[PDB]
């Protein structure tokens, strides 16, 4: 029915100090299969 | 049922878009003869 208060967008949070440290882990173990000096980057799921 | 939907009561800026639609329609009550006129709220990802 009615919405009481304000119309705000639903969101999620992760800690930037924690999440970037975890991507620092998975970019090390990924170099074990693709060799060193390999510029690993991420992107945002092209379509679907 | 063919709904009838307006903007939710909100400060409509041109940059944002309406996330919640009003959608007042007709629906049968528990009696088979009468038809109440009820309203609801619906997300934009549920109405076309």
């Amino acid at each position, epitope marked *: 029915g009615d919405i009481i208060g*304000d119309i705000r967008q639903a969101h999620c949070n992760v800690s930037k100090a924690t999440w970037n440290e975890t991507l620092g882990k998975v970019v090390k173990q990924l170099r074990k299969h693709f060799g060193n000096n390999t510029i690993i980057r991420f992107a945002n799921s092209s379509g679907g | 049922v063919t709904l009838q939907c307006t903007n939710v009561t909100n400060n409509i800026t041109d940059d944002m878009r309406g996330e919640l639609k009003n959608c007042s329609f007709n629906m049968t009550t528990e009696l088979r003869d009468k038809k109440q006129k009820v309203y609801s709220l619906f997300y934009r990802l549920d109405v076309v």
Partner: antibody
Amino acid sequence: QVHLQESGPGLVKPSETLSLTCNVSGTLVRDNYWSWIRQPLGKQPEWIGYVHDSGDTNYNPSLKSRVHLSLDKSKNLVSLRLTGVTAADSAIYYCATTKHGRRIYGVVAFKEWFTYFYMDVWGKGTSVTVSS
Amino acid sequence: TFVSVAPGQTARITCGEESLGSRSVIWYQQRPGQAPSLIIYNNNDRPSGIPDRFSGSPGSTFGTTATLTITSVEAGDEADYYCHIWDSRRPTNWVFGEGTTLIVL
């Protein structure tokens, strides 16, 4: 010190390009949000609009077409202009200084706030009437 | 829109619609014959020069009305009060609210 000296024709003929200026005192026109307020006779006052250099020139959408606010940095002057005044705008006018301020109510990154306004000090005003 | 309170008591001025979203009211004071002034410039915060006896209502509630409470009413409060509400769902209010006069005995 802050105060606002004004002007005015007072008795104006209808369907005429009404104008009104408002002087300064110490502070310059370039460094304050400038707003204009009309108060009808014995009624609640009505915000005509608010003007500033660099973009902030948003008007009241009720009139929206016959109003034109403008600045004068050389004379250190603010100015109001009305085009084609009818017999309903017979009221008093006010030039005023206003301060802004944002009230966040949610995430600041999702544009979930607004910038309100409030007029701390006001001009003395003038009665600008239209009749025959 | 007339409230008659003899001095020494308190007064409550009610203006504006019901609280729809998160508000930020602006309260003014109109001297008779003169130009209006300012009392409250947020829900409760006030500028310097006025006393602490003026107060306001918080705008963090949904379903109330923008009140204006005055303790220790004196003879200088015989003026005209105007609310200027800024709700977060209705658009910009270019006219002020219901002007109530607070006449003191």
